[PDB]
Design a protein around this ligand. Structure first.
Ligand SMILES: [Ca+2]
Ligand SMILES: [Ca+2]
Ligand SMILES: [Ca+2]
Ligand SMILES: [Fe+3]
Ligand SMILES: [Fe+3]
Ligand SMILES: [Fe+3]
Ligand SMILES: [Fe+3]
Lengths: 388, 166, 510, 388, 510
């Protein structure tokens, strides 16, 4: 009705007075800061840390835990809910990690939401402005539809690689970061499909079906080793850190950065394609955002761990060597795509220099952080062998 | 000193562990500890309140020693005892699939953990084992889960009934 | 050249095709079931659109919290008892939300159909949101409320008390340790469908009645996401129904999940609502029956009958063991008040009438005990009395269920009074019901959780409280209190003078 | 204090009791819809209309006004605050206009804010990803810093042309749209300077100062006719509708759309420059946004006015012809810029195709609406006469 | 490869050079001053940062309104008198926000320096936001309040009454008609600095006291933008301070602007606060003195001293006329209640005591009159009495100042009672003060606004109301009312039966 039937303690005269009467003269404690006991990474504790750190109920037998005792219910066999046994890496405290962008759920979906609505505005402006007229037909129907489209399966696979980590991560801060790295990958896979669906609306005859790109990924040659690597990283790795590390600090840093930045982002412009770079801008923004987190966890926290620094670097060095070979193969196969381009699009020198940019950025941003002795010319020469 | 997170038992073991500076000695001590203090088949419950913590400290030492002693391939494919991890995993899954009953199955799964839990077996193979062994064990255990009466189940488990109030 | 774009359904139409075939494309977790390769999902979301819909909800929520509610001093104008109840409700639910994150990541790994993985994925992200939302409630009451202690450090002060253990069983380990399908039943088919969905709403009601407008604002927002999780739980059953294993194990795992959830929430939710509030909304007795019996055990569950799902075989025992459960439990929680991170109160005169009115016989049992304890000076710091002593003096030992972690005193209880004590390989075990007992007997290695008496044995009370930081910022006064008034707060010294030393009750058996 | 000293009627027992006792049993009118008397442009009245329509206090002597009488205070001389005498155009109702995007302040700043935050994120990814490495130094230090930067003054000039209209508009709906069209223009201009400021930060010898691009705009040959038309649309026009119509449906639709879309947007990519297209995507998203508003006002409302249809069209055709010449002139001069491009960048076959796109787009979106009959060949011909 | 970006300040650094020189680069509006084109703005903003900071404020506000405030039914639990008052405050302020757009648009055109134009432009957008915010307030009270009529159609129902004319003088025409600098003085230097900035805050105060949490949510957010405009107003003076024309014209334009603004707000605001509420915050006399004499007339005007700005010479005169101004006006507003778009109420016992306590002499004059009207049945339909009849009976003319449009009655007023009548080329004019009189004598042509008696002359009252839609949804009941209760509402017929026909009071001098 008018006032409704339910009476509320905050506004109901009779109830509020009862409540007000029972209240103390002042707060029963002056420390009004939730998470006051958490060690601040920066000057002052952030909202990100307070709302996140120690949310995971780990006992002290899992580095950094504040609880005590065994789990209340374990798996048949005895496997604990969470345990040190789910990863080779060791640390003094699994809660030391901090996403440098301090992303908790609200800030995360806020930014992605902004990106979504602006993406919608961009496409409506792009279509209404008829910019599709100046795009090379071959680049559009052959390279975007088939090859860029096939790449969605690569990103999809890398997304799935995070499934076990979402379950096994040994701390809240690592779990949130991990979940967001994976969610950004599924988002890119979907944006690749979104572009294909948009083109199908503005270009008569363009088929948005994933059949062609999927066949390219599952049975083609250009992406064969890429697919073999993704399949391994995803389903053959049972260690959540080996997965997150090898994916972001090895495979995606070399293959992913080469394909997105040195191939599509670099050449689409040459064929009058400003559409694909719009989406690749998002993918690259996300890549750099994830890198900051990846670096803080594996290098600042684990690779520089006061007690396990040497150990962790030996393990990561091991994982780097294990995953660098399949990654090189993935790049080597992809070189086959350069032979498909119209003559004069690019040459061996441009292709070589671009390989070196990816390899040099990788050595600087990752390899060097654990003292992995990477030989840049040896890696590039191994890849160039794939040039037909 | 009798604390929850810090006490004499824990300090004592930290010292014993600091004196393990060989992979073989350290790995052997971790497995022994697991046989002596973990699972419902542990040889004793004397360390019930600290074994979880002490075990993690022992694992740390074994991991560190193994990474220094092993080359890269062995670190990925050998157990801390020098066995081939894949053979062990397959050999154990083979036994699990031949398990006649749930009682034989629980012994295989539990024992596998006590002997090969990570710093011993590489995690990749170990969690692949958890995946396979855990599946069979459950399939055997959850079949006609309520048919056996508690009176008879207590006997099969072999507990000593101390007190019944109803 | 018309303005055109692409939405979520248009892309989702092809999501199912995203997954591809390869030899090792299979779940990494042990399971008795096989999830259908072509299972679909109810809602057609993509990362981008999911973010937008959740972002819109956040703006409203944080807007109300930062603007109007803050201007109304809504953080303060709440009954003292409810401010305390929210320390437990928000922090305990927080952990359920959190473990649901790992739980749905495990289900995401289990599903083979891309659409079913995507369904679980959306929940993975929602449970992170919910974890942060529950954290925000405690964060807000600590920053603006009448008593920040507990709200500000529950993540560590919750480890002192026994109620926390049972919470980790139903909402932590119960969500992620076991067959993925068993976990799905604990989380979605039972947990959320039976308890959390109606619970979240019921908390907003109890909250509004007691002056709290902060919780309704956040919890009502949490509720808008639950529809999707319901569908995931339902979809889990569909995906595995046409598999032979299903007929063999589904109802057994469902029965176990039902008993697990019920065992803890039946007595705990009722206790927090009736004893942790000033103004009452509804007697738990009827709330429970409508919840568990009518809505879930009847409507919902029968809908899943076409997939082989049957009503839990332990449903009857749950109902019989439910009537006095929460009353039996508050006696223990209050008697062990120094082990908590919140302040408790004895029922006031008006409340005892309500209790007796709604639960005939309440006064003759609990009523009198509470009157005796206040006569003994349980509220007064100089009395040198703690209700626990009364339990000792009258030979009423308190045990801890080895499986569920729920505290029980069979000699002094009006509900279940069963007790089974077993010895196995040098260790004693105490069980309070025939269902958990079967669980332990069949799965010994799954239940080795040490109880507080085992861990605290031989320890003097004040020492445990000091070690686990159970103090307010002055470093003298206890966070926990036997009353909710603003004066005469017990200090660590008041407890030490008591010279209370823990002992494991099971060691008395030979 | 904890409770504070100020008692609030909503929560104070005593005060709220008094309030509650004075309340009627039910609302005193069931018509709870504000703006219920406004004629809905769509199915149901929208929030955009409710909060905007009739905010302006015009009397009936200004077509559409609902008030009565003269203004309370006028200018020295007698000129009314608002009056029919400030524009040649006539109508049956000045409140008929509707922004197809239905933008009131809130949605407007929400969209621009998301764009600002994503912009910041993009530049952070771009810099971190080192994408500047693949950009042509000449195109940068010289076609972006000088010729793109100079175009900023063109957009700034069009921004100011809106000032008088922000004062003389005869209705809220027309005033709100006008303000937004201009605000978006100043935004574009500030984004141009933003890019140069960004380049300055990542390109060690790049000078952000507006000196170079300004002198090019104030004393160059490339934009001389460009600057001449702007200074005229801005300071020589005293009619708000002529200014708005001539700027958005004549000048910037031809000169503006060619420069932004057919030159920098079409050629920047060819120099490994995806940075500039990022900002041009905004200007174009903005252009097409403003476009639906311009069309609804001058064509849907006025051009098709139930009583002044013919009259208004005559004036707009007149306006189209008046400014079509200075616009065509601004283009010709711009053609001289192609000669400064490195050999092989583009050929007359391409520029001819792009010009026909701009002209044909203009004829399709504006020209044919008011029936001026423009000849695409003659226009393209007269413009093309500015290349050697 | 550092993550890098560019903020507002870094782009704004080069904004001043955005404008370039050319023959016709000058203001399109007549003015006696010259704004220096080197003038700078205080805030270094660009379109995008501006949008972001405003968008964040929108979040909080709309979030509070749509969520918590609606759940608390904030739109209903407001005192009736205040619900009515907000129909006037929000809508009348809306027009000021709206004309301020055109005004700052004109000032944007007036400024030559790019930075000064940018400052004004930022205000153009703010005033658009404020227009929409004030609109939203009426929209929300219409949608969720106890009486939507008036809130729902003030944009047309406000044309019926006399109070609206004077509002247009200070907040519509005063803002845009005349020298750009005169307008800037009316809007920013006087209107905003002396009245609106304090007013908006005070409104949130009175609103809260009367149960209204909606207005505070919206108005406090508007308030956050007011700093930018104060600065704009201040920078206007600095821009013309070095022009010799300034020493010759500024102080006269300011004094006229001062008198213009206080002439309306002094009566009106004090009336709406004290008579449009139940719960009181502070006596208007105290408020007025603080705002006008101390804060503005003293502190604010003083900082402009170094620029040749002196206190308005009409200051003392304003203070003598103020004391009883608001009290005198409510008698006319209530007497003419049928011409409003809101419901009015006579003071209750507690209020009359409050008025006497704060205004000695109040009861013997206003108090006795109100009780005389009520006993005679001014609140009852069936009485056939409307206070306007009492004014006619006791021969107390009501005139409309030709300049300010403010209603005044010489013969009855306790405050100013001067009256000047003049004939010029066949038309009569009535003035209430010496300042407005000079304004008209000097600029005839700027002040030809027709008053309500002139336009309604000879018309029967009910016909003017029906014609202008002064009716509620049922087509018979009047929007306006002489009481705030839910029963015995006056209808178009109750007014018609009165046979009230309007007459031009100036014709009595004929
Ligand atoms: Ca070459
Ligand atoms: Ca014994
Ligand atoms: Ca005077
Ligand atoms: Fe949840
Ligand atoms: Fe959920
Ligand atoms: Fe304003
Ligand atoms: Fe303002």
């Amino acid at each position: 009705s008018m006032l409704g039937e339910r009476r509320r303690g905050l506004t109901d005269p009779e109830m509020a007075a009862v409540i007000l009467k029972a209240l103390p003269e002042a707060p029963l404690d002056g420390n009004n800061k939730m998470g006051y006991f958490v060690t601040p990474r920066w000057k002052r504790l952030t909202e990100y840390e307070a709302l996140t750190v120690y949310a995971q109920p780990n006992a002290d037998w899992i580095a950094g835990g504040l609880d005590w005792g065994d789990w209340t219910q374990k798996f048949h066999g005895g496997r604990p809910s969470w345990g040190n046994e789910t990863t080779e890496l060791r640390t003094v405290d699994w809660f030391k990690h901090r996403d440098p962008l301090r992303r908790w759920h609200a800030p995360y979906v806020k930014d992605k939401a902004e990106e979504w609505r602006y993406t919608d505005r961009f496409l409506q402006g792009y279509s209404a402005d008829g910019q599709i007229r100046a795009m090379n037909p071959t680049w559009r129907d052959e390279f975007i539809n088939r090859y860029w489209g096939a790449f969605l399966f690569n990103e999809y696979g890398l997304f799935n690689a995070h499934s076990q980590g979402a379950r096994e991560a040994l701390s809240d801060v690592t779990r949130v970061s991990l979940a967001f790295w994976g969610f950004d990958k599924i988002d890119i896979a979907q944006m690749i499909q979104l572009e294909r669906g948009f083109l199908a609306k503005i270009v008569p005859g363009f088929d948005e079906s994933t059949a062609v790109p999927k066949a390219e990924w599952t049975n083609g040659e250009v992406y064969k080793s890429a697919r073999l690597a993704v399949e391994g990283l995803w389903q053959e790795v049972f260690d959540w850190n080996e997965s997150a590390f090898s994916v972001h600090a090895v495979y995606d840093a070399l293959f992913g950065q080469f394909v997105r930045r040195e191939f599509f982002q670099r050449l689409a412009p040459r064929f009058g394609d400003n559409l694909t770079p719009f989406f690749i801008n998002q993918a690259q923004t996300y890549f750099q955002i994830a890198k900051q987190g990846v670096q803080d966890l594996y290098y600042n926290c684990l690779g520089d761990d006061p007690e396990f620094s040497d150990y962790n670097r030996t393990v990561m060095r091991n994982w780097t060597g294990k995953w660098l070979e399949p990654t090189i193969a993935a790049l080597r196969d992809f070189m086959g795509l350069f032979a498909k381009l119209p003559a004069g699009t690019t040459d061996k020198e441009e292709i070589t220099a671009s390989l070196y940019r990816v390899v040099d950025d990788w050595i600087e941003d990752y390899a060097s952080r654990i003292d992995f002795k990477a030989d840049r010319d040896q890696i590039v020469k191994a890849v160039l062998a794939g040039l037909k | 000193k009798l604390g929850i997170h810090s006490n004499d038992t824990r300090d004592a073991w930290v010292n014993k562990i600091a004196q393990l500076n060989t992979l073989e000695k350290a790995a052997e001590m971790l497995k022994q500890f697991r046989m002596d203090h973990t699972t419902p088949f542990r040889n004793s419950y004397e360390l019930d309140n600290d074994y979880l913590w002490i075990e993690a400290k022992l694992e740390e030492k074994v991991a560190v020693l193994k990474a220094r002693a092993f080359n890269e391939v062995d670190f990925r494919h050998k157990t801390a005892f020098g066995e081939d991890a894949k053979s062990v995993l397959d050999g154990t899954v083979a036994k699990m699939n031949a398990a006649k009953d749930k009682w034989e199955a629980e012994k295989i799964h539990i024992g596998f953990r006590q002997a090969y839990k990570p710093p011993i077996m590489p995690v990749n193979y170990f969690l692949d084992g958890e995946r396979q062994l855990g599946t069979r064990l459950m399939e055997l255990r959850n079949l006609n889960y309520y048919d056996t009466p508690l009176e008879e189940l207590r006997k099969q488990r072999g507990v000593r009934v101390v007190h019944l109030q109803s | 050249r018309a303005p055109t774009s692409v939405n979520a359904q248009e892309v989702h139409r092809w999501l199912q095709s995203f997954n591809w075939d390869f030899k090792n494309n299979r779940t990494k977790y042990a399971t008795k079931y096989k999830m259908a390769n072509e299972t679909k999902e109810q809602f057609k979301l993509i990362a981008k659109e999911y973010a937008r819909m959740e972002a819109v909800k956040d703006e409203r929520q944080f807007g109300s919290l930062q603007d109007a509610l803050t201007r109304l001093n809504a953080g303060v104008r709440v009954h003292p008892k409810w401010n305390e109840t929210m320390k437990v409700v928000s922090n305990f639910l927080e952990v359920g939300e959190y473990n649901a994150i790992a739980a749905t990541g495990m289900l995401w790994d289990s599903a083979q159909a891309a659409e079913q993985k995507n369904g679980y994925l959306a929940q993975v992200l929602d449970e992170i949101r919910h974890t942060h939302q529950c954290a925000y409630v405690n964060y807000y009451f600590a920053k603006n409320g009448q008593d920040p202690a507990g709200h500000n450090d529950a993540r560590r002060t919750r480890t002192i008390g026994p109620l926390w253990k049972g919470m980790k069983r139903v909402f932590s380990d119960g969500f992620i340790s076991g067959d993925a399908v068993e976990c799905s039943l604990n989380l979605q088919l039972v947990g959320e469908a039976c308890f959390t969905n109606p619970l979240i709403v019921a908390v907003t009601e109890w909250a509004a009645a007691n002056g709290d407008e902060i919780t309704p604002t956040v919890f009502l927002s949490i509720e808008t996401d639950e529809l999707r999780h319901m569908a995931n739980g339902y979809q889990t059953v569909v995906s595995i129904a046409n598999d032979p294993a299903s007929a063999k194990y589904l109802n057994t795992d469902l029965n176990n999940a039902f008993w697990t959830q019920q065992k803890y929430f039946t007595p705990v939710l009722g206790m927090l609502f009736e004893y942790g509030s000033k103004f009452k909304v509804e007697p738990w007795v009827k709330t429970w029956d409508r919840w568990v019996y009518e809505d879930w055990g009847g409507i919902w569950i029968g809908r899943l009958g076409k997939y082989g799902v049957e009503s839990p075989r332990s449903l009857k025992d749950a109902k019989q063991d439910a009537y006095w459960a929460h009353h039996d439990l508050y006696l223990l929680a209050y008697a062990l008040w120094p082990t908590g991170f919140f302040r408790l109160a004895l029922p006031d005169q008006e409340e005892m009438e309500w209790f007796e009115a709604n639960y005939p016989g309440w006064y003759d049992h609990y009523g009198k005990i509470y009157e005796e304890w206040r006569a003994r000076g349980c509220e007064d710091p100089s009395s040198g009395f703690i209700p626990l002593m009364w339990f000792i003096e009258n030979n009423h030992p308190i045990y801890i269920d080895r499986v569920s972690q729920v505290p029980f005193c069979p000699s002094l209880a009006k509900g279940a009074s069963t007790l089974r004590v077993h010895e196995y390989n040098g260790e004693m075990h105490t069980f309070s019901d025939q269902w958990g007992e079967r669980m332990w007997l069949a799965e010994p290695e799954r239940y080795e959780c040490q109880n507080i008496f085992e861990q605290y044995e031989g320890r003097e009370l004040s020492e445990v409280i000091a070690e686990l930081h159970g103090l307010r910022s002055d470093g003298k006064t206890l966070i926990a209190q036997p009353h909710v008034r603003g004066d005469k707060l017990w200090t660590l010294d008041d407890i030490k003078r008591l010279n209370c030393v823990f002992k494991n009750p099971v060691k008395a058996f030979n």
